[PDB]
């Protein structure tokens, strides 16, 4: 009526457990080899005698007269890096200045080009991720920039995280303090005329916390031109003003120590040519600015909760509309689950008291190369850093229909959103508990 028979052993009734597990010493040796914990074979047999493979011949038979089903809970555990190549978090296109030249007697010829910089897999934490990006902009300048004109003064594109506009005085037209108040509010990207960044093929966008208000329109390009209204205002010549006590004030600090120009639009304007995203969003025209088509969001280092799909092709019936095949990247799905990664949050009031000390701690100002320029400076570390953290996930799918004849060797397969094994799985295993559902 509801048996469960196996080769030659006492028949069992009503229910039991078949175990899908990678570890088994025997099968690892033989079976999987060129496989990994995301696409492997395993014997469900569990009987000490019998050579695996020869096991493959045997079968667990759930009484034929009834349609069976089984509860499938699984234990999935990864250890995927915040920033890696497979997830698309190690690359990102941006347009920078390539050459600054003296041409055809009087012309200033500026040549800009798009280029894709890559990051060294792993390096978690958001802030640091920013830094690694800024550094990659530089590392490039080091291989092309300088040796083709282009000064530091005109480095296009830099990810910062502050509100260049806190000091700002509605009359002066300047950041009175003479310094862009060094506190971190949200990541944003700053651009110089003519350049900009593109994330079309990268989840890092999600790390900065900047998304399109219309996601499905593939094409994340944020040009200098887009950051309308909201160019970082200029600094008051704190020195002049004070010593001068008319009043100098109108004097908007044009350079800095080591004399770098703050590219001011004209000898008059209080504004600089440096455009900030964060500004355009909440300080620019809400109806036509950038706030119109992009959204200011919480960072999230994981870069985006993605899901993984399970499949047990040789043991569960194929769900409603999937068709059975043998193409690993199209197997039927039997369970979906978010990919095991969380955002742990910490507190480091030590940030920026630490950037200050961190710089001495790290024997180099590698990230802060321009410790004077109020722009190109090293963005403030925000209190509350986030870090992707891997965690085992004791998930639980529902009862799923089973085949009344379970093969000795079952194939287990965890796929990702785009349907492809996921290299970062360290442990995957599931427990199935069959039971009756109705009869034929």
């Amino acid at each position: 009526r509801n048996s469960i028979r196996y080769s030659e052993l006492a028949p069992l009734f009503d229910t039991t457990r078949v175990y899908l597990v990678d570890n088994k010493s025997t099968d690892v040796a033989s079976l999987n080899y060129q496989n990994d914990h995301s696409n492997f074979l395993t014997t469900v047999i569990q009987n000490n005698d019998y050579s695996p493979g020869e096991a493959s011949t045997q079968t667990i038979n759930l009484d034929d007269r009834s349609h069976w089903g089984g509860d499938l809970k699984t234990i999935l555990h990864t250890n995927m890096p915040n920033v890696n190549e497979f997830m698309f978090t190690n690359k990102f296109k941006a347009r920078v200045m390539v050459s600054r030249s003296l041409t055809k007697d009087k012309q200033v010829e500026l040549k800009y080009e798009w280029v894709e910089f890559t990051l060294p897999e792993g390096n978690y934490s958001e802030t640091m991720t920013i830094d690694l990006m800024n550094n990659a902009i530089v590392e490039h300048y080091l291989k092309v920039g300088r040796q083709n004109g282009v000064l530091e003064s005109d480095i296009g594109v830099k990810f910062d995280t502050r509100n260049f506009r806190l000091g700002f005085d509605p009359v002066t037209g300047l950041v009175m303090p003479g310094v862009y108040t060094n506190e971190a509010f949200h990541p944003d990207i700053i651009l110089l005329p003519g350049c900009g960044v593109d994330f079309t093929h990268s989840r890092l966008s999600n790390l900065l916390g900047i998304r399109k208000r219309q996601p499905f329109q593939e094409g994340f390009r944020i040009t200098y031109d887009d950051l309308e209204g909201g160019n970082i205002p200029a600094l008051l010549d704190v020195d002049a003003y004070q010593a001068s006590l008319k009043k100098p004030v109108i004097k908007p600090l044009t350079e800095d120590s080591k004399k770098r120009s703050y590219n001011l639009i004209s000898n008059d304007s209080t504004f600089t040519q440096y455009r900030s995203w964060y500004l355009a969003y909440n300080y620019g025209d809400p109806q036509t600015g950038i706030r119109s088509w992009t959204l200011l969001c919480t960072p999230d280092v994981t870069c985006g909760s993605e899901q993984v799909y399970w499949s047990l092709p040789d043991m569960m019936q194929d769900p409603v509309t999937f068709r059975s095949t043998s193409q690993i990247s199209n197997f039927p799905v039997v369970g979906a689950e978010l990919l095991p990664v969380h955002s742990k949050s910490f507190y480091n009031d030590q940030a920026v008291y630490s950037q200050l000390i961190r710089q001495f701690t790290s024997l180099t100002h590698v990230f802060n190369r321009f410790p004077e320029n109020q722009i190109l400076a090293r963005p403030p570390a925000p209190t509350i850093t986030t870090v992707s953290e891997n965690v085992p996930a004791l998930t639980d799918h529902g009862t799923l229909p089973l085949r009344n004849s379970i093969g000795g060797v079952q194939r287990v397969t965890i796929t990702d959103a785009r349907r492809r094994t996921c290299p970062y799985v360290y442990k995957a295993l599931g427990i199935v508990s069959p039971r009756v559902l109705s009869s034929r």
Partner: peptide
């Protein structure tokens, strides 16, 4: 007669 509204001294 302009208040920068900022304690430059300290």
């Amino acid at each position: 007669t302009f208040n920068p509204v900022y304690p430059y001294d300290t």
